[PDB]
Amino acid sequence: PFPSAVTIKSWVDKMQEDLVTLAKTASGVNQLVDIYEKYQDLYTVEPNNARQLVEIAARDIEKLLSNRSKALVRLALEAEKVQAAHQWREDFASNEVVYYNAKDDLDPEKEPGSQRIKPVFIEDANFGRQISYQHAAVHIPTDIYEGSTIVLNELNWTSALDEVFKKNREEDPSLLWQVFGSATGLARYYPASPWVDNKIDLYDVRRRPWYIQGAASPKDMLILVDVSGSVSGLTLKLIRTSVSEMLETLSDDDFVNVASFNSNAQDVSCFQHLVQANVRNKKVLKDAVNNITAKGITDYKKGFSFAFEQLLNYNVSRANCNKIIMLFTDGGEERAQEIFNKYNKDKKVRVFTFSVGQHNYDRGPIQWMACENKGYYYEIPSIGAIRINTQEYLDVLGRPMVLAGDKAKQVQWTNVYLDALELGLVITGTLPVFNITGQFENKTNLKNQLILGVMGVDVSLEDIKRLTPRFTLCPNGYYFAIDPNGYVLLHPNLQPKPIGVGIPTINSQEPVTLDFLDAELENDIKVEIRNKMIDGESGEKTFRTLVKSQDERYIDKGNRTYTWTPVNGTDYSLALVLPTYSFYYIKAKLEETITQARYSETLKPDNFEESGYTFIAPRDYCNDLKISDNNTEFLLNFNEFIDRKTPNNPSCNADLINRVLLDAGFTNELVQNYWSKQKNIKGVKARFVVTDGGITRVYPKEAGENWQENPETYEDSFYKRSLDNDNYVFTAPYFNKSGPGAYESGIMVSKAVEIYIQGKLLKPAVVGIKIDVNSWIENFTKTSIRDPCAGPVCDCKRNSDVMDCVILDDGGFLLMANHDDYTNQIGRFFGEIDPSLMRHLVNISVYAFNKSYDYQSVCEPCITEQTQYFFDNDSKSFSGVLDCGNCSRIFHGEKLMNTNLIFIMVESKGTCPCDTRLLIQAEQTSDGPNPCDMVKQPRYRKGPDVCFDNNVLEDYTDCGGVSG
Ligand SMILES: *[C@@H]1O[C@H](CO)[C@@H](O[C@@H]2O[C@H](CO)[C@@H](O[C@@H]3O[C@H](CO)[C@@H](O[C@@H]4O[C@H](CO)[C@@H](O)[C@H](O)[C@H]4NC(C)=O)[C@H](O)[C@H]3NC(C)=O)[C@H](O)[C@H]2NC(C)=O)[C@H](O)[C@H]1NC(C)=O
Ligand SMILES: *[C@@H]1O[C@H](CO)[C@@H](O[C@@H]2O[C@H](CO)[C@@H](O[C@@H]3O[C@H](CO)[C@@H](O)[C@H](O)[C@H]3NC(C)=O)[C@H](O)[C@H]2NC(C)=O)[C@H](O)[C@H]1NC(C)=O
Ligand SMILES: *[C@@H]1O[C@H](CO)[C@@H](O[C@@H]2O[C@H](CO)[C@@H](O)[C@H](O)[C@H]2NC(C)=O)[C@H](O)[C@H]1NC(C)=O
Ligand SMILES: *[C@@H]1O[C@H](CO)[C@@H](O[C@@H]2O[C@H](CO)[C@@H](O)[C@H](O)[C@H]2NC(C)=O)[C@H](O)[C@H]1NC(C)=O
Ligand SMILES: *[C@@H]1O[C@H](CO)[C@@H](O[C@@H]2O[C@H](CO)[C@@H](O)[C@H](O)[C@H]2NC(C)=O)[C@H](O)[C@H]1NC(C)=O
Ligand SMILES: *[C@@H]1O[C@H](CO)[C@@H](O)[C@H](O)[C@H]1NC(C)=O
Ligand SMILES: [Ca+2]
Numbered sequence: 001p002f003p004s005a006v007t008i009k010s011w012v013d014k015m016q017e018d019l020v021t022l023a024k025t026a027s028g029v030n031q032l033v034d035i036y037e038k039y040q041d042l043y044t045v046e047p048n049n050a051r052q053l054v055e056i057a058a059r060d061i062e063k064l065l066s067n068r069s070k071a072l073v074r075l076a077l078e079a080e081k082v083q084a085a086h087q088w089r090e091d092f093a094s095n096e097v098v099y100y101n102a103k104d105d106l107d108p109e110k111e112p113g114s115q116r117i118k119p120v121f122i123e124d125a126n127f128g129r130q131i132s133y134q135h136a137a138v139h140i141p142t143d144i145y146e147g148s149t150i151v152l153n154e155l156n157w158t159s160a161l162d163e164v165f166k167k168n169r170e171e172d173p174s175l176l177w178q179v180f181g182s183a184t185g186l187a188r189y190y191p192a193s194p195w196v197d198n199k200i201d202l203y204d205v206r207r208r209p210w211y212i213q214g215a216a217s218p219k220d221m222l223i224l225v226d227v228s229g230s231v232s233g234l235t236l237k238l239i240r241t242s243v244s245e246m247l248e249t250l251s252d253d254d255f256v257n258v259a260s261f262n263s264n265a266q267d268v269s270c271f272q273h274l275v276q277a278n279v280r281n282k283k284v285l286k287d288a289v290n291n292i293t294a295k296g297i298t299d300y301k302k303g304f305s306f307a308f309e310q311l312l313n314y315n316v317s318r319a320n321c322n323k324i325i326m327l328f329t330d331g332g333e334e335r336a337q338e339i340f341n342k343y344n345k346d347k348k349v350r351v352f353t354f355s356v357g358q359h360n361y362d363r364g365p366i367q368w369m370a371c372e373n374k375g376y377y378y379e380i381p382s383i384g385a386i387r388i389n390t391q392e393y394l395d396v397l398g399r400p401m402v403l404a405g406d407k408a409k410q411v412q413w414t415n416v417y418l419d420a421l422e423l424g425l426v427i428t429g430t431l432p433v434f435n436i437t438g439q440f441e442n443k444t445n446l447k448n449q450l451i452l453g454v455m456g457v458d459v460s461l462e463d464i465k466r467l468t469p470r471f472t473l474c475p476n477g478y479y480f481a482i483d484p485n486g487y488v489l490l491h492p493n494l495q496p497k498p499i500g501v502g503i504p505t506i507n508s509q510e511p512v513t514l515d516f517l518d519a520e521l522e523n524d525i526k527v528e529i530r531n532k533m534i535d536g537e538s539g540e541k542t543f544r545t546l547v548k549s550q551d552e553r554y555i556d557k558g559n560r561t562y563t564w565t566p567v568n569g570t571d572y573s574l575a576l577v578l579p580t581y582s583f584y585y586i587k588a589k590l591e592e593t594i595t596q597a598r599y600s601e602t603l604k605p606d607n608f609e610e611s612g613y614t615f616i617a618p619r620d621y622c623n624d625l626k627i628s629d630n631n632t633e634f635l636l637n638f639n640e641f642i643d644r645k646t647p648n649n650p651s652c653n654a655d656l657i658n659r660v661l662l663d664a665g666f667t668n669e670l671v672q673n674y675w676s677k678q679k680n681i682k683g684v685k686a687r688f689v690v691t692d693g694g695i696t697r698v699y700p701k702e703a704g705e706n707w708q709e710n711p712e713t714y715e716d717s718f719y720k721r722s723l724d725n726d727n728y729v730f731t732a733p734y735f736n737k738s739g740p741g742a743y744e745s746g747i748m749v750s751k752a753v754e755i756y757i758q759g760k761l762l763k764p765a766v767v768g769i770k771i772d773v774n775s776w777i778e779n780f781t782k783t784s785i786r787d788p789c790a791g792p793v794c795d796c797k798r799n800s801d802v803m804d805c806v807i808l809d810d811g812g813f814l815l816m817a818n819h820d821d822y823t824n825q826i827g828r829f830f831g832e833i834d835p836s837l838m839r840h841l842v843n844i845s846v847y848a849f850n851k852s853y854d855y856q857s858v859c860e861p862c863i864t865e866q867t868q869y870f871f872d873n874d875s876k877s878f879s880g881v882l883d884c885g886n887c888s889r890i891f892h893g894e895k896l897m898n899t900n901l902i903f904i905m906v907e908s909k910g911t912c913p914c915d916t917r918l919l920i921q922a923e924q925t926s927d928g929p930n931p932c933d934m935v936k937q938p939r940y941r942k943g944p945d946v947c948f949d950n951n952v953l954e955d956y957t958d959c960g961g962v963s964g
Contacts, residue, residue, distance in 0.1 A: 001794055002907055005879050008892050011784040011795075012903045016896040018779060019771075023728055023749045026684045027767040028674045035666055036755040036764070042595075043662055045760050046587045048472060050540070050563040054576045057479065060467040062569040065429070068457050069411040071168040071175065072431040075161065075455045076409065079180065082160040083452055084436045089156070090149055097155040101146065102137040102195040112147040114155065119192050127176070129193045129421065133169065136162045137192035141204050143388075144185045154184050165190035176423065177458040180433075181205035183395070183451060196421060203420065207249060207391050209511060210414045214430030214454035216397035217947045218253040218319035220274065222307045225260040225292070226329035232294040235357030239328050242356055242380055243289050246326065246390045250277035252415065252485050252513060253943055255318045257310060258285050261303030262296025270932040273316045276941075279510055283501050284931050298329075300336045308343035317938055321947035322397060324350045327369065331361025335368050344373060348950070351375040352393050358382065367961035377960040399449045399955075401948035402434055408948055409434075413570065415511035416461065416489060418496065425461040425496050425512060427489070430454050446955060464490060468574075471619065471656065474582035474692075474763065475714045476547070476558070476723055482533045482573045484942045486515045489572055493519045497856045500863045503927045515939070518855055521546050521555075529562055531940045533573040538565040542580075546850065547724065548868060550717035553732075553921070554811040555850065555870040556724040581723070584760045586692075588658035596647040599665040603695075604639060605632075612671050613704030615711040616660070617694030622652035631711045663693030663765075675699045683775040685746040690719050691765035703770075706745040722752040722766045728899045732813035735827035742826040746770030747815060749899070773816070777823060780805075780816060802908040806830075810900035812838065812847055812869040812921065831919030837891065837906055838919050840882045846893060846902070848872035853928055865926040871900070878904075887912030 024030075092113025100117040119137075121130035138155065140146045146155075158180065165178050169190060179189040187205040195201065205211055223243055231239060243258065250256055255274045259267055269288035275281040307325045343349075351373035353366040358381050370377040376396045378389045401408035411429045419426045433452040438444035468479040468490065481489035488494055491514070498510055516530050525543050532539065542561045549556065564575035601607065608614045616635050618627045625641055628634040647661065648654055667689055675687055686703035690696050694713050698704050709716050718731045728751050733742040750768030754761070784805065785795040796805035796818035806817035814828045822833065831838040841847050847869045857864040878893035891906035 001790070001792075002890050002892070003794060005877060005892055008894050008903070008905055009877065012894045012896060014783045015780070015903075016898060016901075018783070019749075019896075019901075020728065020898045022683050022771070023751065023769055026681055026769045027687045027689075027751070028670055029751050029753065029767060031674045032666070032670055032689075032753045032765060032767060033755050035670055036753075037757070039666065039669075040757070041589075042591065043586045043588050045584050045757055045762065048578065048583055048585060050561065050576050050578055054479075054563050054565050054574055057468045057576075058565050058567045058574045061464060061481075061567050061572070061574065064459065064463060064467060065411075065413070065570055067172055068175075068429050068459055071172065071178065071457055072411055072429055072455045073409075074168070075164055075178065075180070076431045076433050078164045079158075079161060079433050079452065079455070080436055083157055083433075084439070086153070086157040086437070088153060092152050097152055097159070099138050099155050099159065100132075100135060100192050102139045102193070103201060106194070113152050114146065121193070124191070126174075127191065127193070127421075127423065131191040131193045133166075133191060135192055136165055136188045136190050137194075139187045139189075139195060139203065139205070141185050142201055143384075150184055151186065154182055154186055158182070158186075158188055161188060162190070174463070175457065176426070176460060177419075177421070177456070179205070179456045179458075180453055181208070181211045181456060182453040193421065204387065204391070206394075207387070208420075209251060209417060210428040210430050210456050211454045212249055212394060213251060213412055213414055214432050214456070215394045215451060217322055217401060217949060218251070218944060219255070219322040219324060219397070220311060220319050221250065221254065221256045222274075222311055222325050223247075223256070223258045224303055224307050224325055224327045225258065225268070225289070226262075226298060226303075226327070227260045227292055227294050228262045228296045228298040229294055230298070230361075231330055231357070235330050235359065236292075236294050238356045238380055238383065238386070240289050240292070241383065242328060242354065242386050242390055244286050245386050247277070247282050247285060249391060249394075250282065252276055252278060252487075252511075253319060256282075256285070258289060259303070259306055259310070260292060261299060261306065262294075263299045263302065265303045265306035268292060271935060273310060273313045274318050275931075275935050276317070276938075279499055279513060280501055280928065280931055281935065298332055298334075300332065300334045301339050304336055304339045305343070308339070308349070311349060317941070317943075319943060319947075321949040322350075323348065323949075324352060324375075324393070324397075326393075327351065327353045327366065328356055329353070329366060330357050330359050331355060331363050332365055333362055335365040340369075340373065347374055349373065350396070352378065352396070354378045354380060354389070356380045367959070371956075371959035371961060374954075374956050375959070395450055398432070398451050400951040401432070402449045402451060403951045403953050404948050408432065410946070415483075415487060415513050416494070417511040418498070418508045419458065419460075423458070423460060425494075426458045427461070428456050428458050430456050445953075446957075449955065461490070470714070471659075472585050474579060474585075474723060475716070475720050476560075477576070477578045477582050479574065479576055480516070480519075481567070482516055482530065482575070484534055484571050484944075485513075486517070486530055486534060486939060486941060487513045488516055488519050490574075491516075491519045495856045497858070500855045500857060501928075502863060503925055504859045504862045506861055512856075514855060517939070518853065521548055521850070521852060529564070529575075533564050533566075533575060534940060534942050536566045536571075536573065539563075548852070549721050550715065552866060552923075553813070553868060554721060555868045556721060557870070558724045579724070581761055581763050584762055586659070586662075586762065586764055588655065588662040590648075591658070593646065595665070596642075596661060599661040599668070600639075600642050600647065602664050602668040603635070605636060608697075608704075609701055610672070610676070611668055612675070612697040612699040613701050613707070614664075615696035615707070617712045617714070619656060619694060619712075620653075621656050621660070622649075624651065659693045660695065663691045663695050667691060667695055667697050667765075671697055671699060683771060683779070685770045685772045687767070687769050689765060689767045690716055703745075706740055706770075708739055708745075718748060718750045718768070719766050722750045722768075723763055725752070725900070726754075727751075727897075730809050730815065730899055730901055732809050732811065732815055733827040735814075735825065742773055746772045747776075747826070773823075773826065777816060780807075781818065802911065804906045804909055805903075806906075807901060807903045809902075810871055815901075829919075829921040831921060834906075834909060835916050835918045836884065836914035837882060837889075837904070839917070840880075840891075841878075841893070841904070842869075842919075844878070844880055845873055846878050846904075853926075854923065855928070857923070859925050862925055863928040864923045866923050867921050869921065871895075871902075878902075882906070882912075882914075884912035884914040889914075 095115035098115045119132040254277045257274045352375045353370045367377045414428045435448045480491045547558045603614045687699045722729045731748040753765040796803040854864040882889040889912045893904040895902045
């Protein structure tokens with residue numbers, strides 16, 4: 001039968017009291033608070049003024065980037081002067097240029113004008129590779145011969161850069177890379193290191209995003225593809241490959257749209273006006289281009305009239321400078337002077353014409369189109385010419401900024417991208433290098449309107465993370481930074497993996513561009529905060545948001561405070577997220593050499609038998625102490641270091657060490673004085689304590705092998721979840737995993753320690769226990785069933801045919817049930833067990849869901865869809881009547897007040913058949929949002945305001961037709 005709602009409410013109270021009392025007593029919660037008050041005077045509570053913290057960090061980042069920019073400035077000055085003083089030799093006799101080619105074998109045991117250097121690489125932990133600080137290394141790509149007269153002159157005159165490289169490194173020993181990408185192809189980076197590692201080097205410095213960023217200004221490109229009949233066959237494949245490679249040379253500040261025309265022009269993809277060259281809009285355009293067919297009769301006057309009209313659309317967001325048309329055709333007879341006289345008569349749009357394929361057609365008109373319209377003419381006769389002939393239009397685009405003089409020389413920082421030499425997430429500052437031969441005397445300006453190359457220095461994101469310390473904050477507080485496009489420069493949720501672009505089709509060069517809204521859970525207030533950060537404003541915003549847990553299975557409803565300020569000097573904006581309870585932190589005292597030894601003798605490796613197996617967080621306390629992935633090794637190193645000399649020494653962090661020692665003392669006093677009195681308890685398997693300082697202790701020595709949590713305290717999902725909840729939190733175990741399930745370790749319940757010192761509020765630690773399944777399953781089958789109620793069971797027996805007692809958590813996962821089959825599936829989502837009660841619970845708003853996208857995820861055969869369920873109405877009694885096909889299941893649900901637990905009682909599963917559409921909470925591979933709809937309603941961005949797109953002094957004589 002189905003007992004009364006009052007009866008279920010009476011049953012749940014006994015189990016709630018049992019669980020709450022057992023978790024309270026077993027893991028000391030009042031004892032730690034009492035310890036924290038009674039050992040006062042050993043620490044002090046200091047404020048976290050968010051306004052000051054964010055400004056200090058912003059000025060630190062500003063100084064770092066200005067240090068980085070000074071090196072670029074002096075490199076550019078020296079390179080310009082040295083090239084200006086160069087004399088063009090044409091013949092080199094035996095050894096005349098001495099350089100280290102970065103792709104040469106280190107032991108050849110064996111050229112036209114070059115003598116190799118045999119360098120000595122020692123090591124450097126700052127880089128990870130083997131480097132030589134003695135000289136610079138040269139990369140010359142595979143196609144370009146290293147004996148050319150234009151390469152040997154570069155290799156000679158650029159040898160003067162090594163002194164400046166050395167001077168920069170000696171003034172700032174933290175410089176990572178100093179590359180000079182040259183317009184001839186070769187690159188010179190100062191710490192001479194072998195080139196990376198089939199295995200065909202396809203690297204070209206003239207296509208890397210930093211070079212393209214520094215070589216021109218943002219563009220409004222419109223590719224016009226000819227798809228008439230005559231381009232059928234090889235020419236079409238060359239055209240598609242060329243268009244894809246051209247699309248690869250586009251940044252997020254650039255806007256592009258691809259059109260095609262046989263006899264009537266049309267858009268190749270769903271986009272209709274112009275889209276910024278994201279990593280995903282570009283994918284859509286590439287996929288659309290790879291599916292075009294050639295049929296018809298060419299009509300230039302209808303394709304150009306289409307391109308010029310899409311370059312006039314101002315309802316949409318665009319770069320608003322450098323308006324260019326790239327015509328991919330083979331050859332024709334029409335030049336269409338009327339169209340150009342009608343649309344482009346003041347010559348505000350450049351036209352670049354490509355004669356793709358191996359054929360024999362008139363090429364005069366398409367050369368004339370480039371010559372008349374301030375453009376250039378290119379020829380792609382095979383696959384090997386695609387790269388070079390698609391990367392060259394930047395030479396044309398850089399003329400107006402070269403003529404701008406010492407006003408186009410501004411340092412610009414790129415998007416976050418993976419370094420070529422396996423260094424991780426880095427950003428690059430760039431500065432163009434101009435040609436100034438014959439400028440001291442008024443001699444030459446015809447060829448001087450071309451950059452020599454681009455300077456570049458790399459700053460790693462680990463540097464920026466070092467400038468923003470995070471250990472005076474709670475685990476829930478963090479920094480993050482936003483550039484004008486909205487992408488994150490800093491975020492806890494940014495991983496060193498390429499951004500997924502779509503579902504991975506069956507059978508490291510792209511930037512890691514992750515938007516702020518894609519790194520967190522989007523919110524109406526967050527869309528406003530992000531716009532204010534982009535605009536370059538500063539303010540505070542305290543509001544109730546929706547935070548997702550570390551393990552990506554739960555959601556908590558936390559109250560956070562966003563404080564942001566612009567990184568004055570650059571275009572970035574820094575923000576600091578802090579919850580309400582994280583406005584104060586514990587600062588340890590100096591104490592005395594007596595107390596240091598007594599606290600540090602507790603975490604001796606032989607000593608965690610009377611004290612409980614101890615973990616230590618791998619945070620850098622001293623320069624000499626080395627971080628290890630095996631916590632035993634790091635704990636031994638930490639112990640021997642503390643034994644050596646004194647706990648307080650130079651080349652260390654006094655605050656970190658003192659905090660760790662204070663936490664060790666508090667934890668040891670707790671574990672001894674309380675847990676040592678009661679060696680074994682009936683319903684617990686292990687008592688643990690995790691504290692902010694870095695220390696994790698599990699009381700049973702044998703239970704330490706089952707502890708699978710991260711030794712870093714600031715990265716434990718249960719700690720972060722428990723901080724946001726003023727009650728007990730049940731963390732469901734993992735289901736179908738190689739580790740020990742909820743039969744040898746137990747089910748974890750955690751409660752956050754809250755201490756009231758002065759009027760301040762602090763949460764410095766979290767304790768908990770792992771409840772054994774057997775004691776609780778034995779306690780579950782007797783505290784809810786009445787014995788003399790009836791012959792047939794009025795509630796669940798050990799294996800009840802009809803009754804289906806089952807208790808869930810705040811995320812819909814299984815924790816315990818009556819049935820043996822159910823109990824065998826502890827830690828599984830209830831949707832995959834009973835896929836009808838689950839969806840009805842969602843529908844009657846027992847639960848709620850909120851779905852997001854993961855872009856940095858890996859798949860087996862990629863963007864991934866994620867789902868998390870959370871309590872919404874937060875009211876107690878949930879009873880109703882679920883309807884199956886031609887049958888009715890009646891259910892009652894009651895929620896424990898002190899824990900995030902729900903007791904759901906359903907009449908019977910077998911009696912009434914419902915359709916079994918499984919509701920899966922696990923992450924599912926999926927395509928991202930439809931790009932068409934997103935580009936119909938784009939996000940807010942503030943593009944660069946400086947652009948050099950026209951100059952009256954520019955010489956258009958180098959059209960490219962008469963030059964070959
Ligand atoms: C920065 O700008 C300066 C000037 O603005 C530039 O310096 C000039 O560099 C060119 C190299 O391209 C030198 O070219 C001279 O011109 C003669 C005559 O053409 C060349 O002799 C032949 O030229 C043909 C083509 O006409 C060609 O096949 C090949 O270059 C030569 N062939 C044979 C068989 O000899 C020479 O290349 C060269 N002459 C001499 C005597 O060196 C100019 O002389 C340079 N100008 C000045 C004022 O010195 C410089 O390259 C730019 N920076 C960079 C990095 O390119
Ligand atoms: C481009 O290549 C040129 C040829 O190798 C280099 O020019 C040569 O540099 C040498 C320095 O190593 C000069 O030697 C010195 O020159 C001084 C002149 O003041 C004289 O005393 C001597 O000739 C000599 N002295 C000493 C102490 O070695 C060569 O005169 C000079 N010119 C040649 C060989 O024709 C350029 O240095 C090189 N460019 C760059 C940027 O390195
Ligand atoms: C969008 O661009 C079009 C032209 O590219 C602008 O032209 C107007 O289009 C609307 C559509 O019904 C009409 O008011 C007229 O046909 C056009 N008005 C003119 C030319 O003055 C249109 O104004 C742009 N959108 C907005 C909101 O301004
Ligand atoms: C960028 O410049 C502004 C002003 O040029 C700095 O803001 C000033 O801060 C002082 C106190 O530090 C105030 O007295 C001024 O009123 C502020 N001026 C404003 C807001 O216009 C700002 O600090 C600089 N950027 C950074 C990161 O420090
Ligand atoms: C994200 O989660 C929030 C939290 O529930 C959802 O916002 C609520 O949505 C329900 C309807 O599903 C509304 O009745 C509430 O008024 C919403 N709350 C607030 C504060 O607005 C939200 O729908 C979820 N999904 C997304 C995409 O935000
Ligand atoms: C900037 O450089 C100076 C000297 O080059 C150095 O003392 C200072 O610490 C640097 N600031 C940084 C790296 O933020
Ligand atoms: Ca044709």
